[PDB]
Amino acid sequence: KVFERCELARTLKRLGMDGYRGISLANWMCLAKWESGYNTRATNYNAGDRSTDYGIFQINSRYWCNDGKTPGAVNACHLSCSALLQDNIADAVACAKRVVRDPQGIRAWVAWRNRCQNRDVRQYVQGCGV
Numbered sequence: 001k002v003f004e005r006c007e008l009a010r011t012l013k014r015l016g017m018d019g020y021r022g023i024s025l026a027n028w029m030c031l032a033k034w035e036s037g038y039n040t041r042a043t044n045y046n047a048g049d050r051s052t053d054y055g056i057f058q059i060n061s062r063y064w065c066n067d068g069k070t071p072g073a074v075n076a077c078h079l080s081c082s083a084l085l086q087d088n089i090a091d092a093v094a095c096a097k098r099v100v101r102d103p104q105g106i107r108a109w110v111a112w113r114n115r116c117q118n119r120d121v122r123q124y125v126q127g128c129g130v
Contacts, residue, residue, distance in 0.1 A: 001087040003038040003056075005029070006128035013130045015093045021100045028096075029124035030116035031109055032056050040087055055084035057096045058109070064095055 003011070009029055012018070018025040035058040036042035044053040051062040051070045061070040065081035077095035084092050099108050106112050 001040045003032075003040075005038070005124070006130075008032065008038055009125050009128040009130045011089065012093070015090065017093060017097075018130070020097055021105060023100060023106050024121075025130060026121040026125045027106060027112070027116060030119075030121045031106065031112050033124065034111045034115045035109065040089060040092070041085055043085070052081070054081045055092050056089060057084075057092055057099075058111075059084055059092065059095055059099065064099060 009025060012028055013025055017023075017028050032038055035053075036056045038056065040056045042053075042055060042058065044058060046052065049062070051060050052067060053060050054065060054067075059065055059077070059081075061067045061081050062072060063074045064077045065079050065084055066073055066075040067081040077098050079091055079095055084095065086092075100106055102108065107117075
């Protein structure tokens with residue numbers, strides 16, 4: 001499923017993402033925008049290290065979810081990577097919350113540093129009623 005901007009904003013707020021571990025809703029939106037374009041089916045294979053990024057937040061298979069074909073997999077979210085490709089983003093959100101519980105927080109995603117950090121991210125939630 002490809003979410004409409006405000007539809008996703010309201011969904012994430014209901015799932016308790018606003019202010020989770022100090023991260024504003026606009027930051028989560030900025031992350032989803034640049035990682036997958038709000039697409040739950042997005043998948044990116046990293047030929048360099050044999051890992052794959054899954055879903056709307058592009059969660060990696062080496063540390064977070066299990067896909068069975070990634071060497072040195074940890075599976076910290078205790079989820080099959082298949083769960084991160086559903087239209088229902090509940091599992092993806094639960095795993096994203098786990099990612100930010102680590103020291104790096106939202107900085108765990110390089111795209112956030114490049115496209116969201118120190119920027120005016122209000123545009124991502126403007127007019128959504130959140």
